[PDB]
Amino acid sequence: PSAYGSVKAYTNFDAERDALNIETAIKTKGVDEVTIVNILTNRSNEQRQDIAFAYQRRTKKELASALKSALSGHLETVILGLLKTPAQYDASELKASMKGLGTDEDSLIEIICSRTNQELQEINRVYKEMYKTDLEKDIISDTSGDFRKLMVALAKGRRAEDGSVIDYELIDQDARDLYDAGVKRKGTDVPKWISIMTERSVPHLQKVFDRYKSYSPYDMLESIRKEVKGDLENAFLNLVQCIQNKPLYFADRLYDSMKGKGTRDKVLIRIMVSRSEVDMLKIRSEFKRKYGKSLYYYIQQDTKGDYQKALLYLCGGDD
Ligand SMILES: [Ca+2]
Ligand SMILES: [Ca+2]
Ligand SMILES: [Ca+2]
Ligand SMILES: [Ca+2]
Ligand SMILES: [Ca+2]
Numbered sequence: 001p002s003a004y005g006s007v008k009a010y011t012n013f014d015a016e017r018d019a020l021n022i023e024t025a026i027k028t029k030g031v032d033e034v035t036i037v038n039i040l041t042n043r044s045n046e047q048r049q050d051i052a053f054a055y056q057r058r059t060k061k062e063l064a065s066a067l068k069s070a071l072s073g074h075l076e077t078v079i080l081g082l083l084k085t086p087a088q089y090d091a092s093e094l095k096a097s098m099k100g101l102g103t104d105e106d107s108l109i110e111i112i113c114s115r116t117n118q119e120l121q122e123i124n125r126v127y128k129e130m131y132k133t134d135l136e137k138d139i140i141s142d143t144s145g146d147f148r149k150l151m152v153a154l155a156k157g158r159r160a161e162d163g164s165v166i167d168y169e170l171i172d173q174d175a176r177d178l179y180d181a182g183v184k185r186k187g188t189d190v191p192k193w194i195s196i197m198t199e200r201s202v203p204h205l206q207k208v209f210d211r212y213k214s215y216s217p218y219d220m221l222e223s224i225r226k227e228v229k230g231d232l233e234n235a236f237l238n239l240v241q242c243i244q245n246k247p248l249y250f251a252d253r254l255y256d257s258m259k260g261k262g263t264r265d266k267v268l269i270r271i272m273v274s275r276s277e278v279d280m281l282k283i284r285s286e287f288k289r290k291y292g293k294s295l296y297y298y299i300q301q302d303t304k305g306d307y308q309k310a311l312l313y314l315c316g317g318d319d
Contacts, residue, residue, distance in 0.1 A: 005280040006316030009044040018043070019054035022063070026070045033075065033306040036067070040082055041313035045277060048083055074265050075307040078314075081273040087126040090115065093270055094123070095131055098142045105231050107266070108139075110253070112154050113239040114246060120157025146190045147232045153198040154239070160201045171204065175211040182227040183216050190228065197239060205243045247282035248290070250275055254283070255291060258302040265303075272314045284319050294319040 025032035097107040127135040181189035241249035257264040
């Protein structure tokens with residue numbers, strides 16, 4: 001399990017009954033949107049799985065397929081998202097970010113840099129089973145240059161696992177290499193960075209990055225913005241953020257999605273769904289710490305409707 005996320009497993013749970021009340025809410029005219037939301041966002045994900053089981057074995061029509069028709073707009077996006085299992089959701093968002101070589105580079109980057117070894121493996125599996133083709137191929141297909149190399153590497157999900165002894169020598173050797181390969185040099189040995197940052201264990205890389213500051217006048221992030229540019233730079237930046245502080249990373253991503261004119265709902269929804277039973281609690285705390293007001297608050301301000309309520313239940317608290 002994971003004790004660090006909002007939207008905990010609903011106690012008292014009755015799958016059979018819930019599926020009834022959802023039908024009811026659908027069967028109603030205008031849809032009791034309100035109920036559907038009030039239910040599905042206060043149930044854990046597996047709980048939703050046996051509700052879709054129960055709703056199919058009680059009507060002979062698949063719940064997701066039913067709600068697609070029952071709903072519209074960003075609310076649909078949300079709920080439809082929640083019904084998928086974690087791996088399926090990730091897989092689907094991934095595929096949809098590549099639908100054409102007019103790819104949505106940003107969304108790809110996010111899911112890849114943030115997702116862990118286990119998560120990644122399960123995704124690769126589900127992706128192949130879902131779309132009859134390898135995720136690695138689809139990545140290669142829609143990316144180019146160094147960027148491709150990076151994303152592939154990352155998506156293999158073969159990060160060295162958390163070695164339980166601390167390699168103080170290596171940490172130094174790596175930091176050095178990153179410096180030598182980047183800032184110290186004219187131009188940049190990109191494949192080194194890709195190598196070190198993809199392969200090493202995360203708690204190793206955290207320490208590498210803090211050591212790096214002993215050789216370089218700019219921290220790892222600043223070094224990235226200087227030494228490289230483009231979609232590669234964007235990736236590196238995201239990656240580093242995920243290693244140093246992932247809750248914070250997601251917090252910032254959430255902020256950017258609302259701060260300005262209108263809203264980047266595609267991102268906001270994805271994050272709220274995906275991280276609801278993972279690190280949402282840590283995210284909210286980091287967010288509040290940095291931005292002064294709650295996440296709840298920005299979400300409240302930037303979105304409205306039944307939809308807004310869904311998002312709040314997913315945030316799951318006021319802070
Ligand atoms: Ca209505
Ligand atoms: Ca629809
Ligand atoms: Ca594009
Ligand atoms: Ca340089
Ligand atoms: Ca806004």
